[PDB]
Amino acid sequence: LSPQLEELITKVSKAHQETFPSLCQLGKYTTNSSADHRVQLDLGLWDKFSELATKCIIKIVEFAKRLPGFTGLSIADQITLLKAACLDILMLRICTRYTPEQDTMTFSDGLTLNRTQMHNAGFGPLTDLVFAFAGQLLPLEMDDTETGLLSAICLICGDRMDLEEPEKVDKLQEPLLEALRLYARRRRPSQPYMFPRMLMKITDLRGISTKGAERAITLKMEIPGPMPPLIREMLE
Ligand SMILES: CCCCCCCCCCCCO[C@H]1O[C@H](CO)[C@@H](O[C@H]2O[C@H](CO)[C@@H](O)[C@H](O)[C@H]2O)[C@H](O)[C@H]1O
Ligand SMILES: CC1(C)CCC(C)(C)c2cc([C@@H](O)C(=O)Nc3ccc(C(=O)O)cc3F)ccc21
């Protein structure tokens, strides 16, 4: 046991909760826009969705800055890491807000969209793949501490191209991995495959983020103007 590792778990856990409300802590509300038929793009939904996505990018940067040692990396590396992992974390976050009973996803202001509305808000051809990933995440029954640590592991990764000090990044990732294994095994000792199953979700997330970036390219041709600036930063 390590006092420092236990403090890291709570630090990351609190950083995640304070930048990402849990599904049960949100007062859900709906909209009746394009609710019953799939269309190429409902502009009203795209406008609201893109605004919510921008707000969450700011929350992810906020979360990153609260991760022990992140602000110790060069600003260039901080930006490189965020640009490389923001969409992965955006995908994990929306998928943790999936309510299977209603086949809905919920945003941080409580906006709860059904599958067709997610499709019409911009997900388009990627809609069902995103919902399937969310469905496959359910069995893991991760809690918020686990989601926060997994997110931190996705972000603090030394394999990202253009890092100035990849070894320093690798060193910062080490305790996050130790923390997640310790926490996960302690919480559910009879399910020892949970830690490796969680780590493999990172590869799935990268796949779904890759497809999300491809969808952003086509979506650009469907919207009247350019995507929100912080979203463009993430996509470059
Ligand atoms: C991957 C793409 C990201 C690449 C990095 C580029 C993004 C850099 C983002 C830094 C964000 C700017 O941060 C600065 O302005 C924000 C918006 O006015 C403020 O954000 C503030 O308001 C938001 C309301 O919209 C709240 O959700 C934030 O929790 C709150 O802190 C910050 O408190 C301030 O520090
Ligand atoms: C790049 C862009 C703008 C266009 C292409 C698609 C539609 C694939 C997409 C999909 C996502 C998705 O990860 C998501 O909805 N994250 C998400 C998670 C939580 C909140 C919140 O808590 O409010 C808001 C969100 F936005 C994010 C951005 C995009």
126 CA closest ligand 2 atom index: 8
Rounded CA-CA distance 79/183 in Å is 29
What is the Å distance from ligand 2's center to 186 Cα? 32
Rounded CA-CA distance 236/191 in Å is 39
For the chain, the structural domain boundaries read 1-236
Distances (CA, A) of 117 to 60, 191, 208: 24, 36, 19
What is the Å distance from ligand 1's center to 61 Cα? 7
What is the Å distance from ligand 1's center to 186 Cα? 35
Rounded CA-CA distance 35/82 in Å is 33
Contact 209/88 with Cβ under 8 angstroms?
yes
End-to-end CA distance of the chain: 41
61 CA closest ligand 1 atom index: 9
Rounded CA-CA distance 190/138 in Å is 18
84 CA closest ligand 1 atom index: 1
- Could you tell me if the CB of 93 is within 6 A of ligand 1? no
What is the Å distance from ligand 1's center to 73 Cα? 19
- The method of structure determination was X-ray
- Could you tell me if the CB of 56 is within 6 A of ligand 2? yes
Contact 60/86 with Cβ under 8 angstroms?
yes
Alpha helices in the chain (DSSP H): 3-19, 43-65, 75-95, 115-118, 127-137, 144-155, 166-187, 194-219, 229-235
- Could you tell me if the CB of 213 is within 6 A of ligand 1? no
Q: CA 76, 92, 101: angle at the middle one, nearest 5? A: 165
Asked if the 1-236 domain carries CATH number 3.40.50.720, the reply is no
